[PDB]
Point group: D2
Chain length 124, copies 4
Amino acid sequence: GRDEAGITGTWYNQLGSTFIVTAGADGALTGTYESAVGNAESRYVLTGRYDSAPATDGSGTALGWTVAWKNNYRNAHSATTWSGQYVGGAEARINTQWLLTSGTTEANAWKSTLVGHDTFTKVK
Amino acid sequence: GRDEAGITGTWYNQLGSTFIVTAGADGALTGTYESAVGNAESRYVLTGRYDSAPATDGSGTALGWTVAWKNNYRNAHSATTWSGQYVGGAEARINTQWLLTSGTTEANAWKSTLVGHDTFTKVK
Amino acid sequence: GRDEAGITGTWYNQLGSTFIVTAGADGALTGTYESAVGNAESRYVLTGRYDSAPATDGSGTALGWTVAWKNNYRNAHSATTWSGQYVGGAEARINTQWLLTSGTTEANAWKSTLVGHDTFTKVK
Amino acid sequence: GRDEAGITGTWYNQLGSTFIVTAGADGALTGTYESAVGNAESRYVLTGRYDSAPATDGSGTALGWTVAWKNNYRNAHSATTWSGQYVGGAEARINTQWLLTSGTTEANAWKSTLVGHDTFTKVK
Ligand SMILES: CN(C)c1ccc2c3c(cccc13)C(=O)N(CCNC(=O)CCCC[C@@H]1SC[C@@H]3NC(=O)N[C@@H]31)C2=O
Ligand SMILES: CN(C)c1ccc2c3c(cccc13)C(=O)N(CCNC(=O)CCCC[C@@H]1SC[C@@H]3NC(=O)N[C@@H]31)C2=O
Ligand SMILES: CN(C)c1ccc2c3c(cccc13)C(=O)N(CCNC(=O)CCCC[C@@H]1SC[C@@H]3NC(=O)N[C@@H]31)C2=O
Ligand SMILES: CN(C)c1ccc2c3c(cccc13)C(=O)N(CCNC(=O)CCCC[C@@H]1SC[C@@H]3NC(=O)N[C@@H]31)C2=O
């Protein structure tokens, strides 16, 4: 409810990427993502989930979402998942860690997956 | 197509958890997850994405999905994302890495996120 | 050489932790770490390695180090490894990702490892 | 003591890499690593730390180590850290997660770090 409202909207990360999400009453996340970097052009579908009844101790709201990097313009044969928590208030944030897996041969599977962290704000 | 067919079904990981997924023609993943471990009971909604047009060099198919650990029985104030690749054939596998974030206070945010790896097969 | 000089010293991360390191000519890192958070008191031994001949294209210098969280005051039955890169200049930084593993039972091994990111500066 | 003995020796992972380590009485790990894959040839220095007084409940022993991928033959401008736990007994194992950072430009820092998992045994 509070965080359905707080999460729904347009977010921006430190790279200049754009995350457009709707948080549903059932815990769904749906929207589009546009990366400022990488083998990417325009918007990509995203879907995910969030805790629709977080704790009321002042904890964050756990959430995550996935982008497969295929759309009408490109196919980067890869998928990113962001896992993190939403923190509400005047300077709301979504603080995330992500895993970006590329499809590989079996011989290259050891080097399939990048790891990083993205912080999203409502302003940038 | 090939991997819509190959991905859709029931999968099992090394912990004894059960992953029930439908891969759509558009790149969607939908289903339910049941963990054998942790603060979890019964099935949880999952949603994700996969590369619906993978390479044909013998590479894996990149995919990912999210579970928020809230259902009618429990709320563990946390979300897991799995990022990985599907590898088809007689002993098909989905090889994943995952990030499990709990909602935390700001003071505890440094210890919000677990990391691990799960391998899913069609048999176990 | 340049980065032996640049890396050797006292660093501080965003949590207020203190990283005291000597970079040797052979690629060694030695020193002590003091965490501002967690099950930790005072200084802990650290050892690691760095690229002692980085690229000269303006790339970072790859490095990593380990702390086992045992000293004369406490034993937290855990170890952290930081992996990252040093970036020199007026606002030098060491940008890292870390893995913090606790010793667990086999049944709890799935939840053994925390993941996070720390940015170190010469000032804070 | 028990794990000084148990950890010291030659280990092998699922890729066919060779990890030669000495565990000291003070918690030090020293040795050499030879990767079966990647931009690597021959042995590389490793250093790390382990919990020299683990719990006696049947928990694992937390440890970690670093390799910078520079030696007399090659320089891959990168460093790997493994974080994990040693589990003793007839089929002893070291179960690890790793982070492999390459030195990058600032513009490429988002894609600096690979993540994976290696399981080491005394036999393979
Ligand atoms: C050879 N070996 C070292 C690699 C070199 C480059 C790459 C990889 C990859 C996977 C595994 C290895 C490598 C990989 O998936 N890739 C990306 C492919 N896929 C893409 O480029 C799609 C855009 C991804 C944008 C990310 S999502 C997290 C972050 N947050 C944002 O807002 N934007 C960024 C590489 O380049
Ligand atoms: C205090 N500090 C060290 C922790 C101790 C325990 C925990 C945490 C967590 C997050 C951060 C820190 C801790 C966290 O999210 N948690 C889990 C809470 N949430 C749950 O238990 C929900 C079930 C999660 C099951 C996982 S999904 C990846 C894997 N694959 C499967 O098939 N099953 C497992 C902890 O316990
Ligand atoms: C139950 N389940 C969810 C957990 C809950 C709490 C914990 C864990 C752990 C491991 C696995 C699970 C959990 C774990 O290792 N632990 C830490 C134990 N060990 C310690 O507290 C030692 C200090 C570590 C300080 C870190 S190093 C990275 C960062 N950067 C800094 O400068 N300071 C921080 C937990 O609490
Ligand atoms: C372009 N983008 C997607 C990448 C593509 C390839 C690479 C990277 C890297 C870092 C970041 C991105 C990429 C990176 O560090 N690299 C490795 C460079 N460095 C090396 O190859 C040194 C050998 C590393 C061997 C590892 S250690 C963990 C594992 N366990 C073993 O026993 N052996 C393996 C890449 O290739």
